[PDB]
Amino acid sequence: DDEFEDFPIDTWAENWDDVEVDDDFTNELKAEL
């Protein structure tokens, strides 16, 4: 059991990727023509 006092604790003053969203692409401009 070592306290690891040389390395201080930093101070502060089912999932993989899919971090972006496609939103409403729709793209009805093709349907315009």
């Binding site: 089912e14 999932n15 969203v21 692409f25 793209n27 093709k30």
Partner: protein
């Protein structure tokens, strides 16, 4: 007739999650607010009123469900009076020293009223003490399914996981196929909740025939979930025999807009109706995923894979399809199609290489030996690291 009783009411949590999302429409949010306030008034959701007002809603809107202290005290006093009455019944049965079936039933009554207002801890204590009797295995199954339903009610999926693994551990000591189908439906719902969809597809597709667990959700929502998972996982043969021809779905398609949209998307995918596939996918994303609870957290995951499935179906047969033809088929601009298709290739999810100089979308056919070898190498590395860690842990001791 026998019933496990609609305790806790699932619609309470359903409309609570419908309210807590800004993505959903304002009108539907106000309808959910009206329903939840009416149910809080009638069925005495005083502890759940306090929880919903102090967490959930205001944790992240929230004007409609305003934390009224007076309404939190009157209904709480009524609830405590009912709990006192149930305690009187339990103590009078103990004083009369009646049959142990009766004292167990009184314990179930206390626990089911504790669930009826939302307090998880005391309900769990009451049903844990209730299990200590020597009641029949069916009663134990029903009780621990009640704690599983409570875990579903508060949207804590690990609670449901532990409850259902406890169900499975002792389900071999029973055998009653109705009490096993109840557990199958519960396990399928839980599996659908945590991003699995593989076991969920099988259990929900099976459960369309034997669905007597109306205390979890209505039959229409079960059909919706089963159709979604079957579309999302099954292959072009399983779709033809499980989701597109099932008489249970056929009799219920023309009963709900969500079911109609999902069935239309499924039949468009199976019938090569690639022209209107994307608008149907958007309609399903708007009407079936966001309003629900177990699906709205997976709105992105389902949508991303649907595009991959349609691209794979289109590019399996053809080998030198042109980008312009693909864009015309899907009713999108060619540049947008290239942008969309540039995401599934780098991860080797799709099977093609886009030749942008000409517009050719020439197909590349891989060898399953390579993918199997890579998967085996990764799995062996993981297992070996786990084993080394455990062995280092145990050799020192």
């Amino acid at each position: 007739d026998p019933t496990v009783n609609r305790v806790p009411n699932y619609e309470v949590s359903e409309k609570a999650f419908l309210l807590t999302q800004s993505k959903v429409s304002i009108e539907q949010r106000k309808e959910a607010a009206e329903f939840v306030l009416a149910k809080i008034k009638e069925e005495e959701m005083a502890p759940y009123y306090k929880y919903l007002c102090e967490e959930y809603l205001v944790n992240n809107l929230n004007e409609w469900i305003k934390f009224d202290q007076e309404l939190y005290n009157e209904l709480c006093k009524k609830n405590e009076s009912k709990i006192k009455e149930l305690n009187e019944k339990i103590q009078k049965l103990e004083e009369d020293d009646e049959g142990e079936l009766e004292q167990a039933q009184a314990w179930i009554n206390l626990g089911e009223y504790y669930a009826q207002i939302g307090d998880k801890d005391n309900a769990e204590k009451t049903l844990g003490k209730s299990l200590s009797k020597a009641i029949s295995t069916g009663a134990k199954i029903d009780v621990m399914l009640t704690i599983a339903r409570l875990g579903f009610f508060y949207n804590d999926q690990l609670y449901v996981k532990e409850k259902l693994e406890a169900v499975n551990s002792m389900i071999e000591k029973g055998g009653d196929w109705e009490r096993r189908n109840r557990y199958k439906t519960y396990y399928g719902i839980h599996c659908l909740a945590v991003r699995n969809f593989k076991e969920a597809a099988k259990l929900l597709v099976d459960s369309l025939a034997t669905f007597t667990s109306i205390e979890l959700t209505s039959y229409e929502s079960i059909a919706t979930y089963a159709s979604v998972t079957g579309l999302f996982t099954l292959e072009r043969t399983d779709l033809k025999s499980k989701v597109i021809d099932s008489p249970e779905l056929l009799s219920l398609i023309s009963t709900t807009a969500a079911l109609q949209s999902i069935s239309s998307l499924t039949i468009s995918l199976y019938a090569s109706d690639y022209a209107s596939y994307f608008p149907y996918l958007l309609e399903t994303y708007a009407n079936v995923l966001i309003p629900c609870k177990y699906l709205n957290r997976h709105a992105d995951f389902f949508v991303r894979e649907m595009r991959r499935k349609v691209y794979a179906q289109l590019l399996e047969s053809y080998k030198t399809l042109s980008l312009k033809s693909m864009a015309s088929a899907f009713g999108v601009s060619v540049a947008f199609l290239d942008n969309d298709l540039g995401k599934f290739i780098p991860n080797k999810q799709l099977n093609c290489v886009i030749d942008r100089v000409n517009g050719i979308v020439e197909t590349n056919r891989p060898d399953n030996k390579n993918a199997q070898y890579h998967l085996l190498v990764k799995q062996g590395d993981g297992l070996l690291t786990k084993l080394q860690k455990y062995g280092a842990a145990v050799r020192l001791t």
